[PDB]
Amino acid sequence: SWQAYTDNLIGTGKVDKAVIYSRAGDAVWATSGGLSLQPNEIGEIVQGFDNPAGLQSNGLHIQGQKFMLLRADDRSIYGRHDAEGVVCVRTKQTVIIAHYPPTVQAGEATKIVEQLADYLIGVQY
């Protein structure tokens, strides 16, 4: 029930679009809110987790829009565009990408997504 996860996220109103990809980014397991990445965007993100410098350059792009790279490590990648942003987290088997709108505080959206990641990881996913 991967779809329930993305529905749960946007249902809170803290995230308006969320997608769950396989760790490799070769398949979409769930999507809610209508998030649709550009042809090479998921690749940049997936690669970014192992090599942030890569992202740092050209930048992080989601649905065409560029986002400042606020953070990038082995498990988390945070995107920023003023009041709006994106949260990318990698678990044992997935890559979760969520977007929060301007009226939502970045911190609240981030907490909700990181907690999903913590749960999944602790349960082997």
Domain residue spans of the chain:
1-125
Q: Which CATH architecture has domain 1-125?
A: 2-Layer Sandwich (3.30)
Chain breaks in the chain (C to N over 2.5 A) after: none
CB atoms within 10 A of CB 46: 19
CA 93 to the chain's CA centroid? 14
User: What is the three-class DSSP state of 39?
Assistant: coil
- Approach to solving: X-ray
Exposure string of 13-44, with b = 16+ CB inside 10 Å and e = fewer, is ebbbbbbbbeeebeebbbbbbebebeeebbeb
Q: Closest Cα partner for 20 from 88, 95, 87?
A: 95
Say if residues 21 and 29 touch (Cβ distance below 8 Å). Answer: yes
